[PDB]
């Protein structure tokens, strides 16, 4: 299983492509991806000034 341990004040958005349904869980939950569930990888800005 692929399971991500979500931080407390954080949200992870997934979709079950096998089931045609959308769900996003905020808060400190342990997501459990179905065999065709995929994550919302977020490219975020960082660096000293910004990137």
């Amino acid at each position: 299983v692929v399971s991500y341990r979500v931080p407390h004040n954080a949200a992870v958005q997934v979709y079950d492509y096998r089931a045609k349904r959308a769900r996003v869980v905020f808060g400190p939950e342990l997501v459990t991806l179905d065999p065709e569930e995929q994550f919302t990888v977020l490219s975020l800005s960082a660096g000293r000034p910004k990137r």
Partner: protein, 51 residues
């Protein structure tokens, strides 16, 4: 050419002859195999259950 499939045992009679083994392909929903029905050409792209 006819495909015998299922929970049975076969003994090839003198008339008939084996061609190939035809192992099944596992497919879940939102996934399939592009199948060209060479008897009628029509490619069906059967998805869902295993085919």
């Amino acid at each position: 050419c006819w495909l015998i499939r299922g929970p049975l045992e076969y003994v090839p009679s003198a008339k008939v002859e084996v061609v190939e083994e035809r192992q099944a392909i596992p497919l879940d929903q939102n996934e399939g195999i592009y199948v060209q029905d060479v008897k009628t050409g029509k490619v069906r792209a059967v998805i869902g259950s295993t085919y």
